[PDB]
Swiss-Prot record:
This is Endothiapepsin. The lineage of its organism: Eukaryota, Fungi, Dikarya, Ascomycota, Pezizomycotina. One of its GO terms (biological process) is proteolysis. The active site is at 35, 199. One of its GO terms (molecular function) is aspartic-type endopeptidase activity.
Length: 330
């Protein structure tokens, strides 16, 4: 089997992407944030504290003839941006882009933190990291991909995120029309539960490529590209007037600037992030200070190849017995 679903930016900045997901019988379609940096499929629901729901579409398990309470199971997750959610668990039928999994753990939120409430466009998350990170207790549950894998034509999914445009998540096949050149595959460590890999270096604009190993994670659920302070400083040094602002929380730059590209290495291959992808717009409405899309990972504890990086590529998440990651230009 295969599936193919369009993923759509939630706003004009590509802050995140939502993908429609069918849950239950009859289907309840929720728009979920596919997140290769976590491993829980959780949804706003009829169980979510009413004051914490503001415009989201909810899953109502009592209206699904295939929903079953997973007795005794609870979940609770905290993300790198400080947001969190928790609740109980149902199993139900879940379909993405025509690919159906029966008995998928659907984690129903009883509580969500303010950032989730405040984002009316995201009805929940669909985790695509390794199931070892799944938070369901006392019986850990599998991700949608893990459950689907054996049925897939090939044990892969691909992320093809758009810049200010829709893109695609495919399951079970590689669309050879969706990228240019070849896909370069690179090793993955699953030791931390992430799609963790090592970039071979970087370049800023038309500058020379610096060969240096940068371990980080391919994380569709993180907006920006978080890299070591040395790398980030080298990038922003090429933008007149750019500076790190403690008050704003990162590098900012004059909105009048034209940003240089940023290249990262995948083996001997190179992925170029155009400068415009690195512009996250005014820090506050009407400001002429703009927020940068490349930020320091110092004090995160890990480098993160988030959407800024991934949307410059066609990315293969190869879930074979030994997982790997592939990147192609597009």
């Amino acid at each position: 089997s295969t599936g193919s679903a369009t993923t759509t930016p939630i706003d004009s900045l590509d802050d995140a992407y939502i993908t429609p997901v069918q849950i239950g019988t009859p289907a309840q379609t929720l728009n979920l944030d596919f997140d290769t940096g976590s491993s829980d499929l959780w949804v706003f629901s009829s169980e979510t504290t009413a004051s914490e729901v503001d415009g989201q579409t909810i899953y109502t398990p009592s209206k699904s003839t295939t929903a079953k309470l997973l007795s005794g199971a609870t979940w609770s997750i905290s993300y790198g941006d400080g947001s969190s959610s928790s609740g109980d668990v149902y199993t139900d039928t879940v379909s993405v882009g025509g690919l159906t999994v029966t008995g998928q753990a659907v984690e129903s939120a009883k509580k969500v933190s303010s950032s989730f409430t405040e984002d009316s466009t995201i009805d929940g998350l669909l985790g695509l990291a390794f199931s070892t990170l799944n938070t369901v207790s006392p019986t850990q549950q599998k991700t949608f991909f893990d459950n689907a894998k054996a049925s897939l034509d090939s044990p892969v999914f691909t992320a093809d995120l758009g810049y200010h445009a829709p893109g695609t998540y495919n399951f079970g096949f590689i669309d050879t029309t969706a990228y240019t050149g070849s896909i370069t595959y690179t090793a993955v460590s699953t030791k931390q539960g992430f799609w963790e890999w090592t970039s071979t270096g970087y370049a800023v604009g038309s500058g020379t490529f610096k060969s240096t190993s940068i371990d980080g994670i391919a994380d569709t659920g993180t907006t920006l590209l978080y890299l070591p302070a040395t790398v980030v400083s080298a990038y922003w040094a090429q933008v007149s007037g750019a500076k790190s602002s403690s008050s704003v929380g990162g590098y900012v730059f004059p909105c009048s600037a034209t940003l240089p590209s940023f290249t990262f290495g995948v083996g001997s291959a190179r992925i170029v992030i155009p400068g415009d992808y690195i512009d996250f717009g005014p820090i506050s409405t009407g400001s002429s200070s703009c927020f940068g899309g490349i930020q320091s990972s110092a004090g995160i504890g890990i480098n993160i190849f988030g959407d800024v990086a991934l949307k410059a590529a066609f990315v293969v998440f190869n879930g074979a017995t030994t997982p790997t990651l592939g990147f192609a230009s597009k």
